[PDB]
Write a protein that binds this ligand. Sequence first.
Ligand SMILES: CS(=O)(=O)c1cccc(-c2cc(N3CC[C@H](c4cc(F)c(F)cc4F)[C@@H](N)C3)ncn2)c1
Lengths: 726, 726
Amino acid sequence: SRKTYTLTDYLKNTYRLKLYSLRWISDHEYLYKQENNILVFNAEYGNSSVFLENSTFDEFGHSINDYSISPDGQFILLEYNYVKQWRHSYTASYDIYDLNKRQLITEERIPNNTQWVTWSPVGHKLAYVWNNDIYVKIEPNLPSYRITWTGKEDIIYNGITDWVYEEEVFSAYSALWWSPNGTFLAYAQFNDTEVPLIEYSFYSDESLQYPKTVRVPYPKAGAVNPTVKFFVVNTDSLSSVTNATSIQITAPASMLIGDHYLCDVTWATQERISLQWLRRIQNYSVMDICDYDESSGRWNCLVARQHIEMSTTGWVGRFRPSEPHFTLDGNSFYKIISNEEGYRHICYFQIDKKDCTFITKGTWEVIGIEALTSDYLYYISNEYKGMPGGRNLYKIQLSDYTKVTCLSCELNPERCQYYSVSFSKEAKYYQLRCSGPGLPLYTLHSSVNDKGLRVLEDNSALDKMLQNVQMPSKKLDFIILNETKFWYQMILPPHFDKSKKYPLLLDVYAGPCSQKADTVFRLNWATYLASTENIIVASFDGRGSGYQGDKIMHAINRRLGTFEVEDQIEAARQFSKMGFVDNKRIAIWGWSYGGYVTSMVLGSGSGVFKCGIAVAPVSRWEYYDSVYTERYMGLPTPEDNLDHYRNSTVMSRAENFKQVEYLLIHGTADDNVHFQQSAQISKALVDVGVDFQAMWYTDEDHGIASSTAHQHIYTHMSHFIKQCFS
Amino acid sequence: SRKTYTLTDYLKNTYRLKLYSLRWISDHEYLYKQENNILVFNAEYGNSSVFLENSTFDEFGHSINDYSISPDGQFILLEYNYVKQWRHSYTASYDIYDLNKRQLITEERIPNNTQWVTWSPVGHKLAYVWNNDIYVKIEPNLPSYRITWTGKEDIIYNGITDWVYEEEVFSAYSALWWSPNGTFLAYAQFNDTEVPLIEYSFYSDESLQYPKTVRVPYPKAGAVNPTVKFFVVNTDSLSSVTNATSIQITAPASMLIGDHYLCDVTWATQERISLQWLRRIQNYSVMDICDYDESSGRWNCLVARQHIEMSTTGWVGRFRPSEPHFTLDGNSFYKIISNEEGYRHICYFQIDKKDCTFITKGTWEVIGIEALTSDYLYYISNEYKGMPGGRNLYKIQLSDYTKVTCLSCELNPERCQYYSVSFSKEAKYYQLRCSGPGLPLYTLHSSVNDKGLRVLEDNSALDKMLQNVQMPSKKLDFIILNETKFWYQMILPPHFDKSKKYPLLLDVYAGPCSQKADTVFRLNWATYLASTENIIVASFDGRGSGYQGDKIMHAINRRLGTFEVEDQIEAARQFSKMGFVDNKRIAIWGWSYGGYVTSMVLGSGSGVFKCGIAVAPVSRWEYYDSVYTERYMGLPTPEDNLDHYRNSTVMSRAENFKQVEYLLIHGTADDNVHFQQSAQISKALVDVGVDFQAMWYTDEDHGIASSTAHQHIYTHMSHFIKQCFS
Ligand SMILES: CS(=O)(=O)c1cccc(-c2cc(N3CC[C@H](c4cc(F)c(F)cc4F)[C@@H](N)C3)ncn2)c1
């Protein structure tokens, strides 16, 4: 009949998904963006006077990438000149516009090439980082006070993360934290002095005669890590003549004995800062809780307020130890930690009592703690219907742990089983974001007794477009192995017919704590392959997968490249038994870690897979970075785990690629998984006389995300699959 | 019927071509190597007592890759620890073995990592370069005297060439020249101080954690060139206490006005050194003739001894100004230079008279002056049968220029049309090397009256094997354009049938002064394509091609990427009208410059070519080196030829690759045509949404010549072609 979801569609983005990106500026109001004008909305009723006219900056003289209003309500920060660096890092330019006097602030402006700017959480105080140094701006139109003086490009970082900390521990460039009322500014300092550099060519525009060598501090597994220091400064007692004292918090002694990280910093009260440290062996983590000493002017990290979080069967936390949530007085906190049963749940801690009390339990896990009031703790979890791929909002009554309510489960069960939530400032209102299996739906609620105020975005437009196009359907379900359920999804072509045999693509990640089998509604390349090309795209969450407890997640501890790949092969066989699957036509592909799994599967000699694609794969663990690799693999030394580092490379599997058709893709400017890794793969396959397909993407990093390269690659991959399959 | 010439054959070298590599040690004798033992032969009769036993060095303790006997006859130099650098450069270790006391000399030995070693042309004196400095060894058993003290790695070169001089001017690492009796050692010094570096990753064995950045001094078109100086030292008057005086020859004044090169040095007598220099605009070259002054102890380059060689229609000489050949007394010389008519012929010059006299003329060219006696000058030319693809040996009578004899033309016309020659020390005997169209044939002759002494290698073994296998035949011929003939060859399948339509591959180089249409017998990848796969591989020499005069060769002066690609397009079209050519199946491929012409041709939107392959192409001229690019293109400046530099890139033709199937291959460690060039091509084709195949070869340079990579690339290319063709 009518038209399908085509490749063009995915690349040219013809079927747009609507969102409702709001930002709460108080407990009663938010701003909704546009392409035109920031408007302000009243949560109770829905009325909305325009916040600031779209005309304000047509004759500003620059494209303005981003906006950011001070909490005072008195100023807008204006981001422009944005120059992307890593995943989160970038530089930019900045002007401050005073809402009151409808007037740009021109003197003492924030310098260009600024790495990071942040308001204080109450007033209009500014902290910005520039050339690796921290600067504070008490009033927007007044001068800046320098705070640190040791900023050195590529060497000493003040208030910002180095490459590895950005990627692997904080997930952010920022490494400064204001105190709740803005007296204190706490910051981290990282030292890359002795860290080796990864170096690679960047070619740029045709006009550049000589390729430039980019070089970045980057610790590969086992190499010299960056050192970290931590400080706090009073932003009220700085003068402009005395340079300014930063107070160092040190230790703790359980970390100073050897290599360590700082992995969490969370303010508690005006004068309590909580810090989490984690040993290089990411087995053992400590929480410190330090009060300010009015008297001495230094910070007391009182012994006996410290909290050990360890693991006997793996690493601490999902990717890092969880974040604590402090009650208003700051004398107790909730954080997610692993059960005695293996499951991640909420513990109630009293700041000077080591024995925490679990407030939630069960064979399911808590994803994140969303909000804390005086009577209710708010959280996302996968409890509903026993589906680890579902997400819902719950509240637990702080005075009776038996009384927990689902706030999202029932609003629309057929449409909505994957939720996320955004709360107003004292949590009197919340936006719920449903994201599947039906169309994304955005709605507004008031907390007083969880009354549904109104629908913010229903995507009815998209719904109207998508009824004249033959969409694929999705199936979530589980298969059993060794008395355990393992979840898996399948994207099914339209008019699916279980009496016909279909080609199957296995879409894999399989990295530690991953989940490819869930309820989110996704409009992507798989949608095209199923709808236009009649392929079954399938993903499977085997051992090492997350959100189902530690017996699963920790099965691959110290053993990457074993069960997770044994399980993906396992999945394939199982689907090929299902009757609707032509086993002469199973393929497999993955990006990143998924590339690694794919490669490792193709090299296994399973005989299951006719062909496969690996995009920007890891090829041996020693090439990837310290913080990530070590988390799961330990150190690549004889005394520790060198042996399995060695025994788990793609290269050693070279000879078995004779049995398969392989496509190896990689961007030359990958700062994350260096091209080196695909370079060693090809060298291996050349060395043992195996033919394969390749494609470098010049100057593209780990996302190969540019407009045209994104289109080129997907076009290229479609061609390879279609040929493997027709 | 029987077996064909298979791919495995070409790659595993199953049909071995026998050579006869001899080295003349005198006028009466030569050494023929083996895998066994160096024997000595007498040219007159052919008897041969073993020179030095094979067993002398089995218990040596190192693999011995090369040998070199002092002229004295008293020593052998033994090369080992060979470590390849660029095309000609390499390091090595060396031991000197005294023939007479049957004993290796072990004190004062030549240091390892030696960059170059050379005998004196008479005694047993040694000159060697180590750590960019020159050392002389009067006796092998005695200490070395240092000559230069300014050797700095990649900065100051003494007695050796930097990257660009090695590749583009000298075609050698060597930059010293002994005087004919060995009193004087002349040397060049190059200075790379302010030369930009090309930088790239080399990955090495899998064990290496971080990729190393190789970085080489490399002038791209328009960049800062290396400066050169010239010196001469007397090796009889060095003491061991006074450090040793090198006398510098400078100028000429017509060169010092700007950038220049040194491009030839040839000794004339014991006390005359001839030098050729060439302006950076390679339009205008000067020869200096400098005599040693007994009195002052310096060198007079007396003007009115200098000889200008220029070009009004292009560049000086083929790739460089030709080498002069001095008569015994040193008061006259012969060199090849371009006609009034445009053609390359021999001029007789009297060292202090400007007006040289042509001793040969005609619509053919002289290739190289082979030898000069008192009554005879010997040379190779393509005069026989008007065939620019033929080579033959001629002698011209010095006393009557009308009397010139062909010595090679007639020995076997059917089999032999491509000759080269090696002469004994006073030219009393010559070995002729016939190399096609029949099988390579090696014979010995005596000069006295050019009598054929005997056949040294007929390759009858190879002939016997090759009569069991369906080989392809080859056709040489010409087409006419613009009232000019232009030669072309075709490798034709066995059992060729003009009533059948075959797929055609066009094998292209087409670079300045190239010749792909010739008489040489080649056993390579085209042989397989024609034999096994029934493909016509054809090559064509259009404009810009050499050995046919300057009308042709200089047609692409200041205009690379024009006529040479228009002419390959033109040959294809003409071939496709020939009747036996399926024009739904014409392909094209090239390496280096040929990769560039290939890409340029595919981008042209000709509509002739279904598909193509480019190996390691140039992509825009500003990316390739100064000496070569500028020779043909001038300087990439607004005042000069920037406009056509820009107007002639592959990238700008990106859009047109939508119409073809493209395969782009490049080695990541190409020091010659930097990867950068293919990286910019792929970027352009991604930018405009054009699909193509690629393959990088990690750590392979311009030859992609290592055993495994060679095999992999040709296999990969046969797959692409087979597919484009069935
Ligand atoms: C006759 S001589 O005195 O020994 C003698 C003296 C000087 C030079 C040369 C000579 C050089 C070359 N080349 C071959 C073409 C090479 C080339 C061209 C190109 F377009 C590329 F992209 C890459 C590449 F390697 C060129 N770099 C050297 N060929 C022949 N002769 C020879």
